[PDB]
Design brief:
Chains A, B: This is HTH-type transcriptional regulator BenM. Chains A, B: Keywords: Activator, Aromatic hydrocarbons catabolism, DNA-binding, Transcription, Transcription regulation. Chains A, B: Positive regulator of the ben and cat genes for benzoate degradation. BenM is necessary for ben gene expression but not for expression of the cat genes, which can be regulated by CatM. Binds to the inducers cis,cis-muconate and benzoate. Chains A, B: One of its GO terms (molecular function) is DNA binding. 2 copies of one chain form a homodimer. Chain A is an alpha/beta fold and 216 residues long. Chain A has 2 domains: 109 residues, 3-Layer(aba) Sandwich (D-Maltodextrin-Binding Protein, domain 2), CATH 3.40.190.10; 107 residues, Periplasmic binding protein-like II (D-Maltodextrin-Binding Protein, domain 2). Chain A is built from 5 helices and 9 strands. In chain A, strands 1, 2, 3, 4, 5, 6, 7, 8 and 9 form a 9-stranded mixed sheet that branches. In chain A, helix 1 packs across helix 5. The first copy, chain A, is elongated and about 55 Å long. The first copy, chain A, starts with a strand and ends in an 8-residue tail after the last helix. The relative contact order of chain A is 0.23. The interface between A and B is medium-sized, with 32 and 32 residues.
């Protein structure tokens, strides 16, 4: 009985990852699949130690023992209360510059680097450093507090899987207001089970109309 | 500048709580509202110590210093993959007895008692003790893993705020397959700010068509 272990960050559960795992599961009925929630740093260490076989994440970790492949660039969005002035731009979209003086909710509060690191990186990439920032524990806490009137939050587009009363998602107009999705494997990885996993991603992406990830 | 501190469990962010807080916020523009995520045990201790002024939760904690009021009984649901045999009963509903031999995902993994305690209580109330149980960290991990084909999960009805591809919610036919929502305050609490909070709940409930909570 072969076991394949897959690491992932929680922000990916709202997108294509679960259906990729499910299809992969159907292709290998006799395979034990173990799924582990972990940040990219933990993923990097687990891969080198053989504790996982593939890792899905949003942040790069510099390491010569790891091969990282960009799968897709996902859009960032602004989560606001429906009464917020920014929501008048719901159809038009807004710029990162428009958010500088807003109360921004970052998440999660788990080991760094995490999605909050990425969001502040995006701001810093665009010459911005918001001061009114509060790091909350999890995505649902960020969204729930926005819906409660506590501020605004930046989320990946797939996080629109969560819909709450008077919570509205506003597109960002900055071309590089994005959050990439990566698969990470060991440098010399050649397992047919990992190739099969990668082809499953390709199959799902093709059906969605997304650009297929680069050839294995 | 008066400060009111409110404790809450995360499972309530998917329901009416945020809009209650928002309306309450509008009624007191000069009031500082502090929101803290905490379990009912932590809420109990914080209330007695004056560290919070009201606590919203799902579990009872026995304590003579605390007054607890039942707000509403929310339905429990079964989260399944769309291909699961149980999903053929989506319109009909299922019984807790039908779930006994399924791989059940409990959550969260935070200090007890929490929602996982409640779910196992409900099973035990109906003469049932599922053996194939796995406690996962958070609600999104439970739902994401169900969507990935890892098993099934029991959730409050308001958790349908989270919609994922091939994730389906099935009603439970057991009359007492419910999860109550409580507000907890200090026994001798008489603050106008807390009465105002309670009236805000009443106002929101009335507009929703829910039975109004008992008079203050």
């Amino acid at each position: 009985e072969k076991t394949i272990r897959i690491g992932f960050v929680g922000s990916l559960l709202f997108g294509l990852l679960p259906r990729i795992i499910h299809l992969y599961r159907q292709a290998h009925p006799n395979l034990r699949i173990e799924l582990y929630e972990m940040g990219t740093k933990a993923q990097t260490e687990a891969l080198k130690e053989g504790r996982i076989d593939a890792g899905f994440g949003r942040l790069k970790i510099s390491d010569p023992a790891i091969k990282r492949t960009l799968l897709r660039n996902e859009r960032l969005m602004v989560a606001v209360h429906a009464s917020h002035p920014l929501n008048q731009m719901k159809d038009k979209g807004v710029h990162l510059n428009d958010l500088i003086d807003e109360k921004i909710l970052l998440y999660p509060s788990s080991p760094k680097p995490n999605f909050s690191t990425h969001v502040m990186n995006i701001f810093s990439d665009h010459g911005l450093e918001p001061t009114k920032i509060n790091e909350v524990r999890e995505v649902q806490l960020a969204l729930g507090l926005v819906a409660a009137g506590e501020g605004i939050s930046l989320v990946p587009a797939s996080t629109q899987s969560i819909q709450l009363f008077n919570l509205s998602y506003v597109p960002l107009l900055d071309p590089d207001a994005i959050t990439p999705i990566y698969i990470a494997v060991r440098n010399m990885e050649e397992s047919t089970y990992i190739y099969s996993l990668y082809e499953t991603i390709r199959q799902i992406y093709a059906y969605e109309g997304f650009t297929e990830p680069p050839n294995w």
